[PDB]
């Protein structure tokens, strides 16, 4: 009596969670902008009214894809230039003691060594300035990486400047954005929208501080896969950036040594003028206000009448124990002791100066046996960055304890991309559907 | 109309709307379903999109619904697949909820559809034989 | 090319007629001068300016036609 028959509907607005390969869109660099699709000057956003979708930032395939793409790009950029195999030799070093500050005693070592000449049967006695973190004693010293693996010199004309990257899916796939403010990184999002692809995400590398990122809209945002678990990192997104001014003022001089046929090694010859430590300045009042907002948002998940103390990093590698980043080619490791040192209880032009150490031998990712040597940057170097986020780790403690201690953390770069891709998921369209109708062919 | 703006309906705009209302916006979905490390993966992205579109077009064709948005078919709807009424589904349910409901009956429906299309082709051949 | 033909309803047809009228300003030549006195290359060169607008006209005409067909089949 009903006379119900199948009717095929094409273009049905239905999607499904899926994983696909997202290409690059954007406007010599490690990140290949020349080999990317040109972005639409007028991005086309759509509000998915009457829609609710469940998001989970901590299991997003986009983060893993971005990590893999960045690692592949870094591997690609380091291939077509010299590998410093012959650099591993005994180094006769002396302490640099001319025009130095009391805080830079022993940091720089003036090391003389023999080096291979363009001719295979000749040697040249050369000298170079090496940071103390790069040399280990056997007066005799050797590069730290020698007993681990050979180091590949960074291509000199290749720039390390982050460039925004748009991860855009193929046709038949869309990206869902959660525009709901006060979002928690896991669960339903009442305010969902669909996009062709995302905004410009700069692949900024940083530990203990998220630099040049995206800021929150309403207030400081606390995110964690499991806040009750002390083994899960806490990601904090600021609403207002904090200006940080980093500088190495040594007037470094770069010299080229012919280490073979068509192979050049770039060494730090001498520093013009006084030698003093690199550092980073952070506004004291702005940082205090930011930490006040952070503690206000953190007390919501740990109690209102609980002491919240910010302390130093527990320990480990130099990458995680200090704020490690790259600025203008140089690799800074800053002792963030004056920042995370305070306690909070429920109730001027000066700034905090963090000393920083420069390193040339770089173990960029969490890998053993793949090290990089950064050629020195000529002249004074200074740059300014926007602290827009934070990575924290909660100390173990116990339930009986009435205080919660949070220390800076990082190391894993998956969190850095997660902080930018938290409001994004990928879905595949399913335009074919079958419904019952009283129609007959 | 002199003073009037243009509200262009968007892609997947009627996802949360009821099936009856969402069936009126099939075009905005169907019209744009095809359109060193970066280039190599762009290539396979293009290939994936092309093959997905071609498989969808083949599935449409083998059911006799090629080049159509709404295609009335001759196979009856078995009540065991869904006991819900027409007014229930077409006014109190979205397309996504319907897909979740009948996710485990799609293959049988597709097989019946293609079998019926083959039978219709055979019947047309027999009719043309006279 | 196949989808461009399909969005006009000309799927699988080498020669497909359409309801779009031929506006005079596109070409003032008669049928005899077009189909018996010049080739296709000269034609394409002539109507290169009016190609996208014609394509949009055919596209919207086919859209209207399918909407009307759906409305008629609804009853």
């Amino acid at each position, epitope marked *: 009596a009903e006379n119900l028959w199948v009717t095929v509907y094409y273009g049905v607005p239905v999607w499904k969670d899926a994983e696909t390969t997202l290409f690059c869109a954007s406007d010599h660099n490690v990140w290949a902008t020349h080999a990317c699709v040109p972005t639409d000057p*007028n991005p086309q956003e759509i509000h998915l009214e009457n829609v609710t979708e469940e998001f989970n930032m901590w299991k997003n395939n986009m983060v893993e894809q971005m990590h893999t793409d960045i690692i592949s790009l870094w591997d690609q950029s380091l291939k077509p230039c010299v590998k410093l195999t012959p650099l591993c030799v005994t180094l006769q070093c002396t302490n640099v003691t001319n025009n130095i500050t009391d805080d830079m005693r022993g940091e720089l070592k003036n090391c003389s060594f023999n080096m291979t000449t363009e001719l295979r049967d000749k040697k040249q006695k050369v000298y170079s300035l090496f940071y103390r973190l790069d040399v280990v004693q056997i007066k005799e010293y050797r590069l730290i990486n020698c007993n681990t693996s050979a180091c590949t010199q960074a291509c000199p004309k290749v720039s390390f400047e982050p460039i925004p990257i748009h991860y855009c899916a193929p046709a038949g796939f869309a990206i869902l954005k959660c525009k709901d403010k006060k979002f928690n990184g896991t669960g339903p999002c009442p305010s969902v929208s669909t996009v062709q692809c995302t905004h410009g995400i700069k692949p900024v590398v940083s530990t203990q501080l998220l630099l040049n990122g995206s800021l929150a809209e309403e207030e400081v945002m606390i995110r964690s896969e499991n806040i009750t678990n002390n083994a899960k990192n806490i990601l904090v997104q600021f609403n207002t950036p904090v200006q940080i001014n980093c500088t190495r003022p040594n007037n470094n001089t770069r010299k080229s040594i012919r280490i073979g046929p068509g192979q050049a090694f770039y060494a730090t010859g001498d520093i013009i003028g006084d030698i003093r430590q690199a550092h980073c300045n952070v506004s004291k009042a702005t940082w205090n206000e930011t930490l006040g907002k952070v503690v206000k948002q953190l007390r919501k998940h740990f109690g209102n009448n609980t002491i919240i103390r910010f302390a130093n990093s527990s320990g480990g590698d130099l990458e995680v124990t200090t704020h490690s980043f790259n600025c203008g080619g140089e690799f800074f490791y800053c002792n963030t002791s004056g920042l995370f040192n305070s306690t909070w209880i429920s109730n001027s032009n000066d700034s905090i100066t963090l000393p920083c150490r420069i390193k040339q031998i770089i173990n960029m990712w969490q890998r053993i046996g793949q090290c990089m040597y950064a050629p020195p940057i000529q002249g004074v170097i200074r740059c300014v960055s926007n602290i827009t986020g934070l990575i924290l780790t909660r100390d173990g403690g116990s339930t009986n304890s009435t205080t919660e201690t949070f220390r800076p953390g990082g190391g894993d770069m998956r969190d850095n991309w997660r902080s930018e891709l938290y409001k994004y998921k990928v879905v595949k369209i399913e335009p074919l559907g079958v419904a019952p109708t009283r129609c007959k062919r | *109309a002199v*003073g009037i703006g243009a*509200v*262009f309906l968007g892609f997947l705009g009627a996802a949360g709307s009821t099936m009856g209302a969402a069936s009126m916006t099939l075009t905005v979905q169907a019209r744009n379903l095809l359109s060193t490390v970066w280039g190599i993966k762009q290539l396979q992205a293009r290939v994936l999109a092309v093959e997905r579109y071609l498989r969808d077009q083949q599935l449409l064709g083998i059911w006799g619904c090629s080049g159509k948005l709404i295609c009335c078919t001759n196979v009856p709807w078995n009540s065991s697949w869904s006991n819900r009424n027409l007014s229930e589904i077409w006014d109190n349910m979205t397309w996504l909820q319907w897909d979740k409901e009948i996710s485990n009956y799609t293959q049988i429906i597709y097989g019946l559809l293609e079998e019926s299309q083959n039978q219709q082709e055979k019947n047309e051949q027999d009719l043309l034989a006279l | 090319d196949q989808q461009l033909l399909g969005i006009w309803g000309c799927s699988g047809k080498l020669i497909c007629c359409t309801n779009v009228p031929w506006n005079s300003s596109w070409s003032n030549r008669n049928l005899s001068e077009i189909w018996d006195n010049m080739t296709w290359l000269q034609w394409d060169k002539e109507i290169s300016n009016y190609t996208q607008i014609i394509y*949009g006209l055919l596209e919207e005409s086919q859209n209207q036609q399918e909407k009307n067909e759906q409305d008629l089949l609804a009853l």
Partner: antibody
Framework: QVQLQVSGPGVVKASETLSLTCDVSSASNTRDYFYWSWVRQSPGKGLEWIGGVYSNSDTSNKNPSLESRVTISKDTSKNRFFLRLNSVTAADTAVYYC????????????????????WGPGVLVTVAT | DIQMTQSPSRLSASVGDRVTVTCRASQDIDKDLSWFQQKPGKAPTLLIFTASSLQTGVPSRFSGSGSGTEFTLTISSLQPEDFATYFCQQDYSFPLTFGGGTKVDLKR
């Protein structure tokens, strides 16, 4: 669905500038353009169109009678629009409504045959002395 | 400016009666004129656009006809909620000229 809310001073002195602000809360983010217009109704009289402006372009259109006295501005970033009337007289005491007009399309050219033509709750403006 | 004249200025009808209103322009404006309804102390709500198309959510009892200079609004079955002022607005060319309003009151 788009929602309109208007605001402004309920009493304006004669020969002053009457400023009304109407804010819009919608768009579905699809980069539409609406037409934001103002219409007044005097007590015991019919509706009269003051003017309007597009939501994306600076093209603003005015009543020839009120061309010299009306100025319409907009803020698309904050999603609002403002009407300013100069040389207000006793005849301008009226209920002011702010409106958004739009046309529904499937694509650029594929008109679907629908509009919204929404009107705000309105506010009474009295020209006292 | 294009002048709109609406008739009858006022009318009385009971529930279930048929009501007709005529809106006439000063020149040909094609089918570009919308019919609008406004309740006391409320904003106007769209009833009909392009003189023949019913807005979404409007009861089907409302209808519109005519073209050129003369257009007509018809209510087949008057209801208690329909007692509101109706007006006719042109949009063929600037300026947008409204109708004179059509107040309808309950019969007694």
């Amino acid at each position: 669905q788009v929602q309109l809310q208007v605001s402004g001073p309920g009493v304006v002195k004669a020969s002053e500038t009457l400023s009304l602000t109407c804010d819009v809360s919608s768009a579905s983010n699809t980069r539409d353009y609406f037409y934001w217009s103002w219409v007044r109704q005097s007590p015991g009289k019919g509706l009269e169109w003051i003017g309007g402006v597009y939501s994306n372009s600076d093209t603003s259109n005015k009543n020839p009678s009120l061309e010299s006295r009306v100025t319409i501005s907009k803020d698309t970033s904050k999603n609002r629009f403002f009407l300013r009337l100069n040389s207000v007289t006793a005849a301008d005491t009226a209920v002011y409504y702010c409106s958004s007009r739009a046309k529904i399309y499937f694509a650029v050219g594929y008109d679907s045959g629908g509009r919204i033509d929404v009107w705000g709750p309105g506010v009474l403006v009295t020209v006292a002395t | 400016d294009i002048q709109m004249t609406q008739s009858p200025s006022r009318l009385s009808a009971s529930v279930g009666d048929r009501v007709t209103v005529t809106c006439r322009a000063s020149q040909d404006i094609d089918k570009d004129l919308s019919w609008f309804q406004q309740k006391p102390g409320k904003a106007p709500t769209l009833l009909i656009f392009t003189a023949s198309s019913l807005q979404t959510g409007v009861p089907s009892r409302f209808s519109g006809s005519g073209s050129g200079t003369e257009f007509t609004l018809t209510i087949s079955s008057l209801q208690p909620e329909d007692f509101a002022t109706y007006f006719c607005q042109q949009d063929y060319s600037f300026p947008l000229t409204f109708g004179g309003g059509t107040k309808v009151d309950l019969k007694r």
